[PDB]
Symmetry: none
Subunit: 200 residues, 2 copies
């Protein structure tokens, strides 16, 4: 039956994921890698049905591995695990068609449960992440977003104004509105918040 | 096993859902309610394992029913169904401890998977909803938001027009644009959707 890849740089996480996979009835073989470049190389070697990929791997991250798998059109389901709650990581993973996304708030047993969900053909985005992050969507208007992108690119207000055909005045306002909606102290915090959040 | 209740104000869709659920081997019975008050009346008389509730119904909304169930502390699992139109009610659903928040347009097989998931004590939020919520910007402009805040506090068009220093005709066109942007039937419903979605 199933061939499963674990790519996980933390020795205890890796060994525990592998050891619980050996108890799953529909698993016939387990492959492991401690970084993303090693994971890609095993994917060049062997057919894999499902892979667990840790976003915090060195060399190449689990998001890069996911993207490579999808670029290659491999018939491999992908479960990504991460400690971080940044929506930007989640967004990046959704853009590459991740099958499941799990936080390290979860146990190894929970992770196995997600593995079966994905094997039965369904996606599974972390409930608790969705509760924490998705319930606070981008409040910015299309214009406010265009301004914020300007700021993140390092533009001044006059520069932003000229590009958009608007008064220097109007831009500082937009900025004021952005800082308020994002409860941010300055232009830089504002942009950081949107970049971390994947608001571009 | 399951005693189900379906609350849904489009009658043919309600009928279709109950017809198909009743035919499932896992379902012992299905109760029908055409609005949320009717569902509450049924939950007070009958044992129910799982309630399926349209986000929007007359008298009491699906969210109001869910709120009532949690406040009376019933042991009922609750699945709210929605369309993209009301994707942003996700946070009000989470605040009330919804077990699942899923797409209304899905097959009987998919809905039965939701039912089993929630019965086993897990949550299920549709991947498609989560993506839309994450991705969609605020569709309104700053002036549109100002207009809607007026509408939320009961203002006529003339009163908003007077406070904004704009013509009555301008305000009607803004309301028309807003109604179109939110896919809303009336000004009240526009205000609600915008509030709930995070956009005011």
């Amino acid at each position: 039956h199933m061939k499963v890849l674990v790519a996980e740089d933390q020795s205890m996480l890796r060994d525990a994921m592998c050891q619980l996979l050996t108890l799953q009835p529909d698993v016939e073989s387990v492959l492991q890698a401690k970084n993303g470049q090693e994971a890609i190389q095993l994917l060049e070697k062997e057919s894999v049905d499902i892979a667990i990929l840790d976003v915090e791997m060195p060399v190449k991250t689990g998001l890069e591995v996911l993207e490579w798998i999808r670029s290659e059109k491999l018939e491999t389901k992908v479960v990504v695990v991460t400690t971080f709650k940044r929506a930007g990581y989640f967004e990046r993973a959704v853009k590459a068609g991740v099958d499941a996304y799990v936080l390290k708030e979860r146990s190894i047993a929970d992770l196995m449960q997600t593995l079966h969900t994905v094997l039965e053909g369904r996606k599974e985005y972390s409930p608790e992440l969705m509760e924490m992050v998705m319930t606070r969507p981008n409040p910015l208007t299309e214009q406010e977003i265009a301004v914020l992108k300007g700021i993140a690119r390092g533009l001044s207000n006059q520069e932003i104004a000229d590009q958009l055909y608007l008064s220097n005045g109007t831009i500082r306002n937009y900025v004021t509105n952005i800082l308020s909606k994002l409860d941010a102290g300055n232009r830089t915090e504002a942009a950081n918040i949107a970049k971390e959040s994947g608001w571009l």
